């Protein structure tokens, strides 16, 4: 009947927290759901088997007054094997991922890059 875990955490600056999954199996289906419980955080949840650092070029995407959906889509799709953007529940802060091969994987729990204001667009 499925197996479930709970976690609570804090995204401090925008930069995310890593959770390690050892002994993942070929075929097994990972379900992840990330809900805001305080602050203005719009969640981003993702999966990767290799630890290469998202903060630096996500930092570089912020620097661009550039469109952006395409720029962020391209970066995300390249850095994560599967990913999803909080958008409350409208963007269904949640994914389903079937594990391609045996090994240790890591899920990323953090912030997306969004605009919050109507008075100016500064994401």
């Amino acid at each position: 009947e499925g197996r479930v875990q709970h976690f609570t955490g804090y995204i401090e600056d925008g930069r995310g927290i890593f959770y390690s999954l050892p002994d993942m199996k070929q075929g097994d289906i990972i379900y992840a759901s990330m809900q805001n419980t305080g602050g203005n955080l719009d969640p981003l949840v993702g999966i990767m088997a290799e630890e290469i650092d998202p903060a630096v070029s996500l930092g570089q995407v912020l620097e661009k007054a550039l469109d952006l959906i395409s720029e962020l889509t391209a970066v995300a799709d390249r850095i994560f094997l599967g990913w999803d953007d909080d958008g409350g529940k409208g963007y269904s802060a949640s994914l389903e991922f079937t594990i391609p091969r045996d090994g240790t994987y890591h899920i990323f729990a953090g912030s997306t890059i969004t605009n919050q204001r109507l008075d100016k667009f500064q994401p």
Partner: protein, 304 residues
């Protein structure tokens, strides 16, 4: 006439409980939503002064499955502005792509959630405002494309100029205030009361909005000193969404537009400013109601 609003529909197949007011969902599904779509398109010429250089317009309400197109164009040789679309929260859904010739910055989007509630942005953030008059044609569409401010007709009349403080540069006046305004979201359904009219008495538009938890055109006398003595205060709401406010009042107002330099041969301005307390994008004054003589001629009285 035809009537409007929201409803709860209970459908039952071999279920006598449904005609008794009793809808608890049960059993196998038999029914749902039955069927290009319908389109809606709007003009507006937006204008971008030194005063106003970012502008946003809240869209009204797209069904999952709906496509949104928008195009800006220069009126004179004014610069191509930055265009984008966004949700009510400000998360971006699109950007403006400047076109093949380079005369129109166009943008495109079709809709995800069972409510998409979109917001269009255009900015003249790009350069220093040289004479502050570059103006644009904005085209918009889905497939009343923009949700509009409901329109209030305000009226005022004065019965007595009852005090003038020459030292402190203020005065006092007695008068009558009326606002009438048609908002469907106000709508009273008649069988509850058994009447055409619902009355709220002895309270401030503000207070009634709070009680009802909806938006209303609240206001303040701009230069009011302290408190105002308001009598025959009332707000009327009919079923239709037609609404009215009536208030005789006695208010004390600061007017530093006084100059007493050529006293007694001076002349003066008594200005009674009534501002709203909500932006232009929700309510605006649209008409002036001459509901009575504006200034009430008792001439013997005489001081001013």
């Amino acid at each position: 006439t035809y009537t409007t609003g929201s409803f709860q529909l209970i459908l039952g197949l071999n279920a006598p409980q449904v005609i008794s007011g009793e809808g608890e969902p049960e059993g196998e599904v038999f029914a749902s939503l039955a069927s290009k779509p319908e389109a809606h398109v709007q003009e507006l010429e937006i204008r971008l002064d030194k005063d106003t250089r970012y502008l946003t317009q809240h869209t009204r309400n797209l069904q999952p499955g709906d496509t949104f197109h928008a195009l800006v164009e220069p009126i004179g040789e004014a610069p191509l502005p930055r265009l984008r679309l966004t949700d009510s929260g400000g998360k971006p859904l699109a950007f403006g792509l400047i076109d093949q010739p380079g005369e129109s910055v166009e943008l495109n989007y079709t809709c995800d959630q069972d409510i998409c509630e979109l917001v269009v942005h255009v900015d003249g953030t790009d350069g220093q405002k040289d004479s502050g008059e570059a103006v644009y044609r904005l085209l918009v569409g889905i497939n009343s494309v923009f949700l509009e401010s409901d329109l209030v007709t305000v009226g005022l009349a004065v019965d007595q100029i009852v005090g003038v403080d020459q030292r402190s540069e203020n005065f006092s006046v007695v008068g009558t205030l009326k606002l009438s305004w048609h908002d469907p979201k106000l709508g009273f359904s008649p069988d509850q009361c058994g009447c055409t009219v619902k009355s709220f008495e002895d309270a401030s538009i503000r207070a009634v909005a709070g009680e009802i938890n909806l938006p209303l055109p609240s206001f303040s006398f701009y230069n009011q000193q302290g408190n105002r003595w308001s009598q025959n205060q009332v707000i009327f709401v009919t079923p239709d969404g037609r609404a009215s406010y009536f208030e005789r009042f006695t208010v004390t107002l600061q007017a530093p537009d006084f100059d007493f330099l050529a006293y007694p041969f001076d002349r003066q301005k008594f200005s009674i400013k009534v501002d709203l307390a909500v932006p232009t994008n929700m309510f605006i004054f649209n008409e002036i109601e001459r509901f009575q003589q504006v200034v009430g001629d008792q001439l013997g009285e005489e001081e001013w």
